[PDB]
């Protein structure tokens, strides 16, 4: 009973979370996950500011209202060579990664590790935060509030 949460640097408070290294988060689980990080789904405006500070990924993830990929450099295998906040238009499927926004983060790039999940609740799951540099923080708990996600 274990969940890995792979987390990125924050840019103007915005970061990317991948559950178990594969697209596997529903829209409801995404909201609950950000809440566990004392964060919210970013607005489009928040994501555009993050992009302007250096944020890019090669992964679809939820923001408030849409599924997006922030792109700085054009890459053929990431968002079909687009730059800017690329918006997913057509998909059959419902599960992606998520973005989250923490207002208390530094205003620009913060590439320090994440070492807590401050708003997780009591539960039986071993939840491990995995940073890109390999640094890990684990705790026993839960964050999912919708039965359909568990
Ligand atoms: C990157 O960015 C992503 N994917 C792969 C794996 C991992 C880990 C940690 C953090 C992040 C990530």
Swiss-Prot record:
Name the positions where hyaluronan binds: 22, 59-60, 86
Maturation and modification: N-glycosylated. O-glycosylated; contains chondroitin sulfate glycans which can be more or less sulfated.
Disulphide bond pairs? 9-111, 34-100, 58-78
> In which compartments does the protein localize?
Cell membrane; Cell projection, Microvillus; Secreted
Glycosylated residues, per the record, are 6, 38, 81, 92, 102
Tissue specificity statement from the Swiss-Prot or TrEMBL entry = Expressed in the intestinal epithelium.
Q: What is known of its domains?
A: The lectin-like LINK domain is responsible for hyaluronan binding.
From the Swiss-Prot or TrEMBL record, give the protein name.
Answer: CD44 antigen
